[PDB]
Amino acid sequence: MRVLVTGGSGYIGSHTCVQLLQNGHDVIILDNLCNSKRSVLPVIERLGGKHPTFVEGDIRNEALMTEILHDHAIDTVIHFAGLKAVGESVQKPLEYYDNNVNGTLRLISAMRAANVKNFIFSSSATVYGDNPKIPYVESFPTGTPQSPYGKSKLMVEQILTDLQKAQPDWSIALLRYFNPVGAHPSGDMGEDPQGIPNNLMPYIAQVAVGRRDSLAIFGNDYPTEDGTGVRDYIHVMDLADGHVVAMEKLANKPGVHIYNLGAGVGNSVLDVVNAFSKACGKPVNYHFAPRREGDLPACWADASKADRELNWRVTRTLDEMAQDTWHWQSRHPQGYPD
Amino acid sequence: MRVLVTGGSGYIGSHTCVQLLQNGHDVIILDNLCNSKRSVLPVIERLGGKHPTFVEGDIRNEALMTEILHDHAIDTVIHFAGLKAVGESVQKPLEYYDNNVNGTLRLISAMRAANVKNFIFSSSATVYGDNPKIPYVESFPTGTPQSPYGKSKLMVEQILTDLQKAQPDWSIALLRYFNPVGAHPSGDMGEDPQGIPNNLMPYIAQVAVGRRDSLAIFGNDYPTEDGTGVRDYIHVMDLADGHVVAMEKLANKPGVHIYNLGAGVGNSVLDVVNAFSKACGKPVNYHFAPRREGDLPACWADASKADRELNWRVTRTLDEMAQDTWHWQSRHPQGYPD
Numbered sequence: 256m257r258v259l260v261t262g263g264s265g266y267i268g269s270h271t272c273v274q275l276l277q278n279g280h281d282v283i284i285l286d287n288l289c290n291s292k293r294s295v296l297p298v299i300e301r302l303g304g305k306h307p308t309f310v311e312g313d314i315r316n317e318a319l320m321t322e323i324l325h326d327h328a329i330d331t332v333i334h335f336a337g338l339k340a341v342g343e344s345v346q347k348p349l350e351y352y353d354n355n356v357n358g359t360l361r362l363i364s365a366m367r368a369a370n371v372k373n374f375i376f377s378s379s380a381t382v383y384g385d386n387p388k389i390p391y392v393e394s395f396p397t398g399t400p401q402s403p404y405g406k407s408k409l410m411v412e413q414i415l416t417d418l419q420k421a422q423p424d425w426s427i428a429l430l431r432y433f434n435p436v437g438a439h440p441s442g443d444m445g446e447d448p449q450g451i452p453n454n455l456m457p458y459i460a461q462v463a464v465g466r467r468d469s470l471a472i473f474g475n476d477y478p479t480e481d482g483t484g485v486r487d488y489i490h491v492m493d494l495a496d497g498h499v500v501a502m503e504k505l506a507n508k509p510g511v512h513i514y515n516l517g518a519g520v521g522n523s524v525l526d527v528v529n530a531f532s533k534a535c536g537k538p539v540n541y542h543f544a545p546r547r548e549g550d551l552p553a554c555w556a557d558a559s560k561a562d563r564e565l566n567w568r569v570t571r572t573l574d575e576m577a578q579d580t581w582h583w584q585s586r587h588p589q590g591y592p593d
Numbered sequence: 594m595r596v597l598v599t600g601g602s603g604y605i606g607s608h609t610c611v612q613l614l615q616n617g618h619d620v621i622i623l624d625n626l627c628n629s630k631r632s633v634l635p636v637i638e639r640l641g642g643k644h645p646t647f648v649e650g651d652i653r654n655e656a657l658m659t660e661i662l663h664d665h666a667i668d669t670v671i672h673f674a675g676l677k678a679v680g681e682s683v684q685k686p687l688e689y690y691d692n693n694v695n696g697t698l699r700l701i702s703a704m705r706a707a708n709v710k711n712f713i714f715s716s717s718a719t720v721y722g723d724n725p726k727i728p729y730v731e732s733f734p735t736g737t738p739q740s741p742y743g744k745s746k747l748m749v750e751q752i753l754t755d756l757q758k759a760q761p762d763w764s765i766a767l768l769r770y771f772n773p774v775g776a777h778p779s780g781d782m783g784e785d786p787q788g789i790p791n792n793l794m795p796y797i798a799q800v801a802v803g804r805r806d807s808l809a810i811f812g813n814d815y816p817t818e819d820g821t822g823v824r825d826y827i828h829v830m831d832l833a834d835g836h837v838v839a840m841e842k843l844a845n846k847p848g849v850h851i852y853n854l855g856a857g858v859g860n861s862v863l864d865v866v867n868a869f870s871k872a873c874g875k876p877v878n879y880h881f882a883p884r885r886e887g888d889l890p891a892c893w894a895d896a897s898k899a900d901r902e903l904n905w906r907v908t909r910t911l912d913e914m915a916q917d918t919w920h921w922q923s924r925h926p927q928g929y930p931d
């Protein structure tokens with residue numbers, strides 16, 4: 256198929272793109288480069304064994320979107336473009352609502368105009384908000400997310416939902432997940448965060464690499480097996496894979512197809528650290544801190560539906576998430592070149 | 594003060610504008626005229642005993658907003674601009690999210706740029722969603738509205754809230770209400786709906802006037818005193834008044850000031866019809882229909898807070914809502930001239 260991948264050069268998008276090309280689809284990447292570099296492009300092409308078209312631009316530019324759409328005869332769109340830093344979202348809420356909410360709106364409005372009706376939304380498990388029932392299942396109603404980031408994701412979920420309802424020929428997937436981790440097995444692509452990493456894994460990696468002194472673990476008194484918080488971590492390759500199957504199987508199947516993507520189990524902070532110490536050959540440094548405010552002791556997603564309906568499940572392990580991450584750090588200590 | 598009233602030429606805005614001028618503020622009306630006519634302008638000026646500045650334009654035009662802001666040295670903004678037809682919102686959800694959600698976002702983004710930090714949002718009681726606890730109080734958490742219209746209102750409420758939180762010097766009022774009815778006592782301004790009126794009152798009026806044959810009443814079996822649905826109706830003059838006091842008293846008082854504006858009581862469909870038959874001098878024609886889907890038997894807002902905090906309460910009666918409405922119909926059977 257002909258797919259427009261917004262946010263194509265990002266962490267998730269990059270890996271998705273590689274898997275897309277490998278499956279032989281024609282890929283058009285639309286990215287404003289606000290959080291990625293052109294330098295990943297050639298990597299994608301190489302790893303994908305095929306050339307993707309790149310367009311520098313912004314989802315908020317409805318006119319350009321339309322143009323793209325038409326120009327490339329897009330059949331479907333995978334939308335990864337947006338801001339995703341939670342703390343920053345609390346500080347800069349307007350930028351989050353404009354990039355996520357308005358940005359998707361402008362994107363779908365252009366699809367409407369270009370006659371495109373297959374969409375895959377890279378969503379978020381924050382949409383379940385504060386549900387005490389875990390693991391979370393697609394059949395649980397959503398809750399009220401705590402940051403502007405989370406709120407923005409749900410708002411887009413609702414708008415897409417209403418749209419489909421008004422334009423019932425549309426096929427829209429809402430892919431929910433938590434923590435993408437790892438890197439391509441080649442060690443030639445991976446997460447390249449600028450500044451202090453918000454996510455555990457990359458933080459760990461940086462500490463390990465010697466850029467950070469020690470990991471502060473928020474709380475050691477949860478009602479968890481080891482006392483640290485339990486989260487859901489998904490290898491970026493599996494997630495990319497989930498994105499492709501979803502795209503491929505849902506195309507032209509009218510509806511709002513909601514799926515949680517994850518391993519189906521949780522892993523504690525210590526488990527993540529130990530797996531990491533294991534990958535990098537040395538004990539990761541850490542210390543305890545107090546519960547970070549708004550944290551649940553444990554949380555994870557039930558991924559039965561995706562298994563059943565898309566015949567999709569993860570295949571990478573926590574250890575692999577670690578190795579691969581350390582592998583990319585090790586081969587490209589400076590990340591993507593400028 | 595210097596006030597920008599977006600949606601200034603609309604039903605609510607027009608009346609608000611008149612009361613603003615009477616209090617001697619300087620008024621700038623920004624309206625795209627999508628649902629109003631320039632012809633109301635001179636009425637406003639006359640009734641207000643003062644000249645308001647009019648700018649034709651769209652809230653979604655961030656650049657123009659900014660310009661206005663600066664140009665007129667705005668101190669505060671009353672935002673009435675948006676789409677508000679529920680049924681249409683289900684049919685055309687994107688237009689609702691773009692006008693309401695993006696439109697407010699662009700508006701507040703321009704305020705940010707122009708350094709304006711006093712805002713009065715003309716909200717909606719739909720935000721309480723399906724609460725079985727009535728009357729609704731500002732202290733009740735919000736629920737999930739049922740249409741894109743309702744959803745859009747809540748989303749804007751949330752964005753404004755987050756913004757204030759990030760920019761704590763802002764003063765933002767979220768004014769919630771239900772059914773504005775009536776017209777200026779002069780009979781020279783009032784609601785001028787194009788097409789089939791969605792609201793009860795105007796529908797009634799049209800039937801009465803001979804444009805409509807009969808009113809269909811949805812359900813006669815509710816757990817209400819007379820069996821018909823109980824709603825909350827507020828005279829447009831009182832509501833306008835609430836908008837002005839809010840503006841005047843809240844200016845520069847940092848926070849998110851939430852207030853329900855209403856009479857504090859509910860009135861049934863029959864009560865509304867009888868008051869109308871009474872105003873127009875003849876029995877309004879009606880018939881019963883089945884419960885319209887998604888309707889509660891009764892619903893109304895508690896307006897104690899506004900009384901207490903702003904010393905505001907309504908002063909017009911249901912009968913007056915009717916008379917005034919019939920009065921405007923009677924003096925301007927064709928509404929505003931083209």
Ligand SMILES: NC(=O)c1ccc[n+]([C@@H]2O[C@H](COP(=O)([O-])OP(=O)(O)OC[C@H]3O[C@@H](n4cnc5c(N)ncnc54)[C@H](O)[C@@H]3O)[C@@H](O)[C@H]2O)c1
Nearest residue numbers: 262265266267286287288289290291313314335336337339
């Ligand atoms: N990484 C996570 O922990 C996390 C968890 C939940 C959901 N997501 C979602 O997945 C998506 C992809 O995130 P990611 O992890 O790959 O982050 P990422 O920043 O690496 O990728 C996003 C890409 O989009 C681009 N972009 C941002 N705003 C844009 C705009 N207006 N127009 C065009 N391009 C724009 C950035 O340049 C970047 O390359 C986002 O929707 C994010 O909300 C990620």
Ligand SMILES: NC(=O)c1ccc[n+]([C@@H]2O[C@H](COP(=O)([O-])OP(=O)(O)OC[C@H]3O[C@@H](n4cnc5c(N)ncnc54)[C@H](O)[C@@H]3O)[C@@H](O)[C@H]2O)c1
Nearest residue numbers: 600603604605624625626627628629651652673674675677
């Ligand atoms: N009337 C009701 O029953 C109801 C109940 C709840 C809330 N409200 C809210 O009050 C506000 C005013 O509504 P109203 O009853 O006076 O309706 P209205 O349509 O008469 O007034 C709205 C005005 O805004 C203008 N407008 C619409 N979209 C615009 C945009 N993008 N840019 C600039 N101008 C634009 C229209 O031309 C119109 O004059 C809206 O926010 C509405 O959601 C009204």
Ligand SMILES: O=c1ccn([C@@H]2O[C@H](COP(=O)(O)OP(=O)(O)O[C@H]3O[C@H](CO)[C@@H](O)[C@H](O)[C@H]3O)[C@@H](O)[C@H]2O)c(=O)[nH]1
Nearest residue numbers: 341380381433434453454455458471472473484485486524
């Ligand atoms: O320096 C750190 C970083 C994280 N943690 C812990 O590591 C676990 C995982 O933390 P984090 O990366 O923040 O995971 P999540 O809380 O699972 O947050 C992710 O999933 C959410 C859905 O609930 C989204 O809001 C976010 O964008 C996303 O990063 C948690 O128990 C944290 O307390 C630490 O102890 N120290």
Ligand SMILES: O=c1ccn([C@@H]2O[C@H](COP(=O)(O)OP(=O)(O)O[C@H]3O[C@H](CO)[C@@H](O)[C@H](O)[C@H]3O)[C@@H](O)[C@H]2O)c(=O)[nH]1
Nearest residue numbers: 679718719771772791792793796809810811822823824862
């Ligand atoms: O032809 C008609 C029109 C209305 N009604 C009834 O009249 C009452 C009032 O109806 P309506 O004008 O639709 O009032 P609300 O249901 O109170 O809706 C208003 O308040 C809501 C907040 O819950 C918003 O979603 C809407 O924009 C707004 O018009 C209800 O019991 C209706 O069933 C009839 O019987 N026949």
Ligand code: NA
Nearest residue numbers: 420421683684
């Ligand atoms: Na429809």
Ligand code: NA
Nearest residue numbers: 589590591592
């Ligand atoms: Na670098």
Ligand code: NA
Nearest residue numbers: 345346758759
């Ligand atoms: Na802040």
Ligand code: NA
Nearest residue numbers: 927928929930
């Ligand atoms: Na007319």
